[PDB]
Symmetry: C3
């Protein structure tokens, strides 16, 4: 699409933690509509977000965010009493800031990047059970002028599953040749993984796109990741390669053999996918 | 050192998959010349490569490449019917492109980098058996103006082996002090590793060399890598450190202890290596 | 903040390998004062360091450094006889260099970075026993103009411990809001880890700080690391987030559950830490 605007808006959302079928737990923006991964939160540097949070579960839960600014009262840990008791409510406050020159001449890094939020108190005091059960979601913070995508897809390697899905059950994502597609890639649990995409590649830097001819970042199609790592990128679907059912998978061999695979289904403008028969 | 020219040539090559001794399999450019790792393929951005492929083994095999442009018919997977039956032949086509500005002003990244190719169908439909057996090889794509090396060596951490060699059997690589030496480093299998070189270091970026004083890339001598990761770099052999049998190894302690170790043998101009006495 | 000057000095230090309580082993700059991690060595690009080394132990030991310039005789390995026999002495020499252009015009990377030293011969020919026992320490090489910190803290994930400490025993580090705090982060052993710091973030590049608005490095608060990896960064304590007990931990879930955790204790300018009430 276009470009991200300058931030500075004070935003507000309601968030709920809720049980889902099969022992799962999820975040949602409306009661009864929790999802795994949780809802995508998008902010422009400078924006503030007040998360009006409610725990609808029978066990305590919390909300811990990576990368963004928050005071200790929004750490989301039992250790500083910022979790939410069953049936309880709490306002978590997330802030973001633009980069800038400090008075002493140093450069303050901004909040922009591919981040995520997750539980920190279900099962253990590091949220091992909550994360296992699905209490995680993506956060994107944009810098003014960042290129905006046609669509964004979140892929979470959570131990031996993608997005808590059963082995060999996706997710699949659909695009048309030429679409600007953004991927947010988060890892959770116990294991390291390597994320691989067939037919596409990106830059190993903040936006996943080279800034121009002077950017020396490695261009990659395979990336090692460990628990609580996050990164993201944009690709032009099918660019230089055409339509097709382009696989993505963890490249740890036993993981790909045991279901950590999905498809990036890139259609021609006429809606067909060459060589794909499901 | 020389410099890579602009690409745009159409090239052909023949490649075979063959069984090797002891359950191994490898790729080669000629029959009976299969090797692990497979042959090094070097391209300049814009080059097209037609790989005339032949499966001489008794089980299906394929060729899947990282990084390069290919249509879905050269994916090299059973899922897309781009594998090769026993005794069969197939032409895989790889393309590359230069970076440049798109119609809308965004910057399209080029193909240049350190890449690799491997099997995708032996044992499992992700090539777990074929990769284990040795079916992997390096691909280098160069950008116009890239610095060219005096020699290139490929180091593959394939599970707990280097290049499928028996434990504690190298490989070793020879150079003379001052040689410009290129390393392609690929990882395969189940395990993470950390690649370490004694006496040398490189930049954690596309070429392994800093572009100049503005490049903030960390300079490293140790790098974590996982299955199907690839990177590469160039060093000046012995620069600031002199001749010697310079160790490289995985730094995961049990892996180095079990034999994931080799030597970068850097000779003085008279050909000697001080303090080198292999046992 | 201060700024690093150009290097070029020749320095010498004594270092000792010593047994410590509980079967541990450490390096120290004075006899009887070994520590785990070993002493922080700081150099400016161009400096030379002569390490006058003594093995006080009953087993061979060595000193292997990452990143810095050294000849094969200071490799610290048995195979080229650069280890130190029990009771023995040896001078290890480390050199560093500035970046610049070679005679052919190519750019040579300098020595600056976050590095480390460790044993290479105790237990195995790769120092597996020595590293496990505590024979590791940090080295920082600074480039002219690098920002200098108010304090530097070294965090080593040595297998399932931080700095060889028992589980759930820190270390904790103290600062005041606004302090410029440098972290050196080293990993050793058999396992991968992911280092995470609550409330703070850094740039994934040489210094951990962006050079300016044109540096495209990812800004992160979580980093995967494996044996013998080293990186570092600086943060302004509490910047944009305030005082408090800010946790750092490995984010591998069973590792944090088993106590690879510590606290960055950031005090208010009046000396208090909000929300931090540790049990007696
Ligand atoms: Cu935490
Ligand atoms: Cu995996
Ligand atoms: Cu986290
Ligand atoms: Cu694949
Ligand atoms: Cu290894
Ligand atoms: Cu692959
Ligand atoms: Cu070594
Ligand atoms: Cu850990
Ligand atoms: Cu080491
Ligand atoms: Na980088």
């Amino acid at each position: 699409a276009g470009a991200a605007p300058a931030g500075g808006e004070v935003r507000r959302v309601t968030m709920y933690a809720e049980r889902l079928a099969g022992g799962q737990m999820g975040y949602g923006l409306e009661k009864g509509k929790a999802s795994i991964p949780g809802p995508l939160i998008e902010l422009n540097e400078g924006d503030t977000l007040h998360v009006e949070f409610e725990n609808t579960m029978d066990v305590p839960v919390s909300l811990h965010v990576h990368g963004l600014d928050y005071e200790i009262s929004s750490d989301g840990t039992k250790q500083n009493k910022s979790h939410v008791e069953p049936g309880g409510t709490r306002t978590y406050t997330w802030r973001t800031h633009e980069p800038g020159r400090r008075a002493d001449g140093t450069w303050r890094a901004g909040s922009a990047g591919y981040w995520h939020y997750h539980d920190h108190v279900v099962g253990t005091e590091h949220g091992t059970g909550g994360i296992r059960n699905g209490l995680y979601g993506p956060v994107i913070v944009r810098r003014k002028g960042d290129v905006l995508p046609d669509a964004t897809h979140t892929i979470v390697f959570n131990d031996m599953t993608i997005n808590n899905r059963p082995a060999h059950t996706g997710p699949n994502f659909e695009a048309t040749v030429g679409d600007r597609v953004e991927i947010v890639m988060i890892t959770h649990g116990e294991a390291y993984h390597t994320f691989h995409m067939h037919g596409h590649r990106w830059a190993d830097n903040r936006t996943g796109m080279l800034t121009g001819p002077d950017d020396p970042s490695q261009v990659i199609d395979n990336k090692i990741c460990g628990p609580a790592d996050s990164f993201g990128f944009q690709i032009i679907a099918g660019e230089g390669v055409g339509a097709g059912a382009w696989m993505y998978h963890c490249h740890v061999q036993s993981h790909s053999d045991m279901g950590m695979v999905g498809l990036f289904l890139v259609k021609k403008p006429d809606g067909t996918i060459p060589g794909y028969d499901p």
